Symmetry: C3
């Protein structure tokens, strides 16, 4: 159960990082995004 929770948390960390990058690009207009 715990190891599956860690795997869920690791996946959330990657998704959250992807979202931060996308939001920063929208906020700053990087490369016309």
């Amino acid at each position: 159960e715990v190891e599956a929770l860690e795997k869920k948390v690791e996946a959330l960390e990657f998704k959250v990082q992807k979202l931060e990058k996308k939001v920063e690009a929208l906020e700053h207009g990087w490369d016309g995004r």
Copy 2:
């Protein structure tokens, strides 16, 4: 403690999904968003 952690993780998964949908709409201008 663990069951509460799972419940926290399940809630984060739903929020992260909501954020992905909103960010994709901003990125692609869907329906004028």
Copy 3:
């Protein structure tokens, strides 16, 4: 392991909240964002 998982989850909660605020601002054009 569990206490470290909680600490990871607490950090994800803060990041997710930051992302919600930023996305809401982009969506609504608050203060010209």
